[PDB]
Amino acid sequence: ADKELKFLVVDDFSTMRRIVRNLLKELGFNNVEEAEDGVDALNKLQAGGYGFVISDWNMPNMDGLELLKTIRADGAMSALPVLMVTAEAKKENIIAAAQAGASGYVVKPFTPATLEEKLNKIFEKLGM
Amino acid sequence: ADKELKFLVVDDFSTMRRIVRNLLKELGFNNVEEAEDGVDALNKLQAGGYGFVISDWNMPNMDGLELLKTIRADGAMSALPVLMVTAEAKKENIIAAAQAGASGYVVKPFTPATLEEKLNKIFEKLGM
């Protein structure tokens, strides 16, 4: 994918955002911003420019499933890639996320290799 | 749901197809056919008339994940309900099926109540 692709990294814990930002850097993507919840994330997205969202699920103010659904229903950003990265691993919840339009799903804790594979699967599926 | 709804039950072992067939009858669905692999299944699905697929994962010729992907990518049956019923219980398998478009996912062994619950969950989601 284009290395200038602008990522939004969403999680309510700095440590988790830090992990994903560093990994993205390793993969050659330095155009990365952070958000600490779904509202913060929507505020940044509507400022424009973003080409990929990586999001946690359990967060205050607006959780990640709501964020995903909000993105998917919004005609301005309905096709924005959204990769869920979350400790949530219950079968019904994994299905709920896919059905809400998740581009991919990663369970914490995850390895660098897993994140890289998940991103590339999405890049390819979407021809990026 | 409509008791005439036609089901296709896909598994490479007769015993499991037999379990599902009998459960569906108990629930009032007698319009039920069987297939022994993904290819057998697609042959029947393309004969037309099916309203619901219940499918195993591990099968020769074409496995259930390939079967699901094929169904979902096909213009003529892309929204066909597909309930996975499989011994594959790893989260990475569940994710792969969910992301591929599974309507639901039940892990073997399963009780009659679980199958009924998950079928009804799919009926409600699709307004059937």
Ligand code: BEF
């Ligand atoms: F972490 Be961001 F700046 F809200």
Ligand code: BEF
């Ligand atoms: F808080 Be997340 F869902 F891991």
Ligand code: BEF
């Ligand atoms: F088992 Be089926 F009839 F192919």
Ligand code: BEF
């Ligand atoms: F063989 Be199946 F996936 F249970």
Ligand SMILES: [Mn+2]
């Ligand atoms: Mn913190």
Ligand SMILES: [Mn+2]
């Ligand atoms: Mn969280």
Ligand SMILES: [Mn+2]
């Ligand atoms: Mn479930």
Ligand SMILES: [Mn+2]
């Ligand atoms: Mn047999």
Ligand SMILES: [Mn+2]
């Ligand atoms: Mn038909």
Ligand SMILES: [Mn+2]
């Ligand atoms: Mn099998």
